[PDB]
Structure formats: C-alpha cells, structure tokens
Amino acid sequence: LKEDFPLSHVISPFTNQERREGMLLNLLIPFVLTVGPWLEQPEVQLLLQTVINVLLPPLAESTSQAAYLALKVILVCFERQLGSQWYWLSLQVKEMALRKVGGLALWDFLDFIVRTRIPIFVLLRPFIQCKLLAQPAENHEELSARQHIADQLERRFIPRPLCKSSLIAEFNSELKILKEAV
C-alpha cells in the first residue's frame, strides 16, 4: 500500500528531538539496507529531506555520527534514482563543511566520498582541493588524517568494490559497532 501507507506516517511521530538518535540508528538504517521493494521518487525525497534536516537544522557527536551514516547509506543505495538531482544535494553539502557541523565524522564522510567517488565526487573534487587545502587548518586531532585524504585523491590506484554487496559488509560491521557504542 504505497498510496494509503506511505513511509511518511511511520517516520512522522519520531522526528521530534526526544530519542531521534535511536530512531535513526535502528529504524531507518535497517530499512534502507534491507530494501537496497522498488521505492517511488516522492517517498525517497521525503526520506532524504528528513535525514538531511537533522544535519542542517532549518548537534551532539553521537547523533551527528548516526546522521552521517544515514546519509551515506541512503546516498550509496539509491544511486540509480537519486542522481536525478545530484546538484541539489551537492549544494546542501557545501554548507555542511562551511559551518562545520560535526566534529570529526565530517572528515570521515568526505574521505569515504573520495574513496568510493560516487557521482557527487565529480562536483566536490574542485571544492575539496583548492578552497579546502589553502584555507586555514588549525592543528589538532582534526588534521591527524587530513594528509591521508589529501594523498588519497592525488594519484592512488582506485580498486573500487565490485558491487554494493561488498560495501554493505563494512556498513553492517560499523553499524554493529555503533550499536554497542550507545
């Protein structure tokens, strides 16, 4: 029942900041993982909007990490149908780093993007090199892996995983790790 029971109903009552960390961790990630049922465009739109809302409110480290995981999984799974609007997302990811939402998981997300270099990378490659290296980089734990990303996209051979199936293994492993983290 797509028309009568859209996904919006089950996600609406738990948007309020009461326990949305747990909701996002163990109600949405498994949903997309196990159906990644051919979802229709509008429900995908609603889902993506809801997830990205947490990242960029119209704050805690754990909830931000779970938000990043939700965005990553949604992004990698729906690569066939979401890509109709890459530009749109590619703009809402600039403010992401502009205002520095999330302490350290931001760099993890960006390095993952570089590694897999899903189509969004074709738009972020210029913005992630000239205006992100030259910009002042304060010396602390944030820069521990910075050189790693810097070198990653320079010339390294890129052994992409054959299929999403290979990546889903690491996804599930880190999902479990985050589950015990809570």
Other CB atoms closer than 10 Å to residue 132's CB: what's the count? Answer: 16
Helix %, strand %, coil % for the chain, to 5?
65, 0, 35
CA atoms within 13 A on the CB side of 5: 2
Tokens of 172: 């599930």
CA atoms within 13 A on the CB side of 64: 17
Q: Enumerate long-range contacts of 122-127, CB under 8 Å, 24 or more apart.
A: 123/86, 123/87, 123/90, 124/90, 124/93, 125/153, 127/94
Elucidated via: cryo-EM
Q: Which residues of 2-37 are buried (b: 16+ CB within 10 A; e: fewer)?
A: eeeeebeeebeeeeeeeebbebbbeebbebbeeeee
Tokens of 5: 């029971």
> Cβ distance 128 to 93 under 8 Å?
no
CA atoms within 13 A on the CB side of 138: 5
Entry resolution (Å): 3.1
